């Protein structure tokens, strides 16, 4: 009794004690990467350390080579802080998933991505480093008297749900040299080692973000927020922390990054992922079709395919709005299909067939003469801040809602039963729910998830 937490004297307001508990915070600023934090650690950017879109505005980007790095000095007043005292730290990553070839070929290669390790003589090493092994992610200590302690976490062979696997994560580790070590993932405790009795920690004056010793000449791995806190925080610090950086502002596509005008995605209902969206026929309706999936028990990894069903590409209701191609939640769109390389819009025809006089059957390509195809729809996100998915409400061309756009299990003439697209007030009466059926994923094609 004994702690060996910073003292801040703040033990209430979670956001002060994050604040006042931070050592290192870097942020990207007119293409600009620097600590904020107030200690001013400098930060040298080598010329192939890229910029991409991040969780928040940019993010940094690695890719395989010696020019592709980012080295932060530790200003003298932080320098020694984990030497034997606490220390947390957290950054978003996103890594892509990695191909059945090259878990076979490249699964065994350790490499690093962020280390403050120190060679000293004896064979020792000393630091802490975060390193990738296949699907695993490591977190590493070691002492100035070559004590080693590890954390490593497998992650879920299912890649549309696993953290390894394209989509932006946030990931949290909290040192105690009183107790353990513990790795969170998106606020969730991931794993754990009691590191108790460690020694003197003698590492590196720099802090290093690098592919170290990675043999896949293609891999890269993006960063974001990196940030270093002289306290181990606790779950509840850690949700809120999560939490802060979920910025309101534009809506996202299935992998974490802004969603955009002019881009194709392919849909899939959170509620049901395994589902695949398809057409009838033009100026006819839309269902769900179990999409096919991949299975490596050799590998044991396994997941629905990607990029099968329809295309869809989000326009400016009312055009041109110059620069920004960045959706906002709040804009209002509309919604195509491209379809034998022509686009056709979304909507309900007046007095349109509907089920019940209520759940209304959206129609893609509709041109009937004289009917009003109603069209405007507002993208929003209402609801789960956690998942990376969107809402789409559709008007008359009065104001008047027609509802989110969702499913219904029925049948259309004597077509088989299905899960049809529809338009419905129903949900907004139950937004609350673990799980409903207006929650959509927008997928884009990407590079770092190619089917096998
Ligand atoms: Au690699
Ligand atoms: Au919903």
Same mark, same amino acid.
């Given at each position: 009794?004994?702690?060996?937490?910073?003292?801040?004297?703040?033990?209430?307001?979670?956001?002060?004690?994050?604040?006042?508990?931070?050592?290192?915070?870097?942020?990207?600023?007119?293409?600009?990467?620097?600590?904020?934090?107030?200690?001013?650690?400098?930060?040298?950017?080598?010329? *192939?350390?890229?910029?991409?879109?991040?969780?928040?505005?940019?993010?940094?980007?690695?890719?395989?080579?010696?020019?592709?790095?980012?080295?932060?000095?530790?200003?003298? *007043?932080?320098?020694?802080?984990?030497?034997?005292?606490?220390?947390?730290?957290?950054?978003?990553?996103?890594?892509?998933?990695?191909?059945?070839?090259?878990?076979?070929?490249?699964?065994?290669?350790?490499?690093?991505?962020?280390?403050?390790?120190?060679?000293?003589?004896?064979?020792?090493?000393?630091?802490?480093?975060?390193?990738?092994?296949?699907?695993?992610?490591?977190?590493?200590?070691?002492?100035?008297?070559?004590?080693?302690?590890?954390?490593?976490?497998?992650?879920?062979?299912?890649?549309?749900?696993?953290?390894?696997?394209?989509?932006?994560?946030?990931?949290?580790?909290?040192?105690?040299?009183?107790?353990?070590?513990?790795?969170?993932?998106?606020?969730?405790?991931?794993?754990?080692?009691?590191?108790?009795?460690?020694?003197?920690?003698?590492?590196?004056?720099?802090?290093?973000?690098?592919?170290?010793?990675?043999?896949?000449?293609?891999?890269?791995?993006?960063?974001?927020?990196?940030?270093?806190?002289?306290?181990?925080?606790?779950?509840?610090?850690?949700?809120?922390?999560?939490?802060?950086?979920?910025?309101?502002?534009?809506?996202?596509?299935?992998?974490?990054?802004?969603?955009?005008?002019?881009?194709?995605?392919?849909?899939?209902?959170?509620?049901?992922?395994?589902?695949?969206?398809?057409?009838?026929?033009?100026?006819?309706?839309?269902?769900?079709?179990?999409?096919?999936?991949?299975?490596?028990?050799?590998?044991?990894?396994?997941?629905?395919?990607?990029?099968?069903?329809?295309?869809?590409?989000?326009?400016?209701?009312?055009?041109?709005?110059?620069? *920004?191609?960045?959706?906002?939640?709040?804009?209002?769109?509309?919604?195509?299909?491209?379809?034998?390389?022509?686009?056709?819009?979304?909507?309900?025809?007046?007095?349109?067939?509907?089920?019940?006089?209520?759940?209304?059957?959206?129609?893609?390509?509709?041109?009937?003469?004289?009917?009003?195809?109603?069209?405007?729809?507002?993208?929003?996100?209402?609801?789960?801040?956690?998942?990376?998915?969107?809402?789409?409400?559709?008007?008359? *061309?009065?104001?008047?809602?027609?509802?989110?756009?969702?499913?219904?299990?029925?049948?259309?003439?004597?077509?088989?039963?299905?899960?049809?697209?529809?338009?419905?007030?129903?949900?907004?009466?139950?937004?609350?729910?673990?799980?409903?059926?207006?929650?959509?994923?927008?997928?884009?094609?990407?590079?770092?998830?190619?089917?096998?």
């Amino acid at each position: 009794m004994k702690n060996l937490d910073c003292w801040v004297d703040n033990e209430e307001d979670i956001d002060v004690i994050l604040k006042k508990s931070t050592i290192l915070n870097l942020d990207i600023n007119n293409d600009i990467i620097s600590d904020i934090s107030g200690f001013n650690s400098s930060v040298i950017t080598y010329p *192939d350390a890229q910029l991409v879109p991040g969780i928040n505005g940019k993010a940094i980007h690695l890719v395989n080579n010696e020019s592709s790095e980012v080295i932060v000095h530790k200003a003298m *007043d932080i320098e020694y802080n984990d030497m034997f005292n606490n220390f947390t730290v957290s950054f978003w990553l996103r890594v892509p998933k990695v191909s059945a070839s090259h878990l076979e070929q490249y699964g065994t290669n350790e490499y690093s991505i962020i280390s403050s390790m120190k060679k000293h003589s004896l064979s020792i090493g000393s630091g802490w480093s975060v390193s990738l092994k296949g699907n695993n992610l490591i977190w590493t200590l070691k002492d100035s008297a070559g004590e080693v302690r590890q954390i490593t976490f497998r992650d879920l062979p299912d890649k549309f749900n696993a953290y390894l696997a394209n989509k932006w994560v946030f990931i949290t580790i909290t040192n105690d040299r009183l107790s353990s070590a513990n790795l969170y993932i998106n606020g969730v405790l991931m794993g754990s080692a009691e590191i108790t009795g460690l020694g003197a920690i003698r590492e590196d004056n720099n802090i290093t973000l690098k592919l170290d010793r990675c043999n896949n000449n293609n891999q890269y791995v993006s960063i974001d927020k990196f940030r270093i806190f002289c306290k181990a925080l606790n779950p509840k610090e850690i949700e809120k922390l999560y939490t802060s950086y979920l910025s309101i502002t534009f809506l996202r596509d299935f992998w974490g990054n802004p969603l955009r005008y002019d881009t194709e995605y392919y849909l899939i209902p959170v509620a049901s992922s395994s589902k695949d969206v398809q057409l009838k026929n033009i100026t006819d309706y839309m269902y769900l079709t179990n999409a096919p999936s991949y299975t490596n028990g050799k590998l044991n990894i396994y997941y629905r395919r990607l990029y099968n069903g329809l295309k869809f590409i989000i326009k400016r209701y009312t055009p041109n709005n110059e620069i *920004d191609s960045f959706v906002k939640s709040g804009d209002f769109i509309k919604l195509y299909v491209s379809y034998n390389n022509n686009e056709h819009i979304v909507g309900y025809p007046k007095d349109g067939n509907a089920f019940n006089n209520l759940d209304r059957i959206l129609r893609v390509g509709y041109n009937a003469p004289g009917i009003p195809l109603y069209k405007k729809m507002e993208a929003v996100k209402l609801r789960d801040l956690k998942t990376y998915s969107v809402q789409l409400k559709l008007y008359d *061309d009065k104001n008047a809602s027609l509802g989110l756009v969702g499913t219904h299990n029925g049948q259309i003439g004597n077509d088989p039963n299905r899960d049809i697209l529809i338009a419905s007030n129903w949900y907004f009466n139950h937004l609350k729910d673990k799980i409903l059926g207006c929650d959509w994923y927008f997928v884009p094609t990407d590079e770092g998830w190619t089917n096998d």
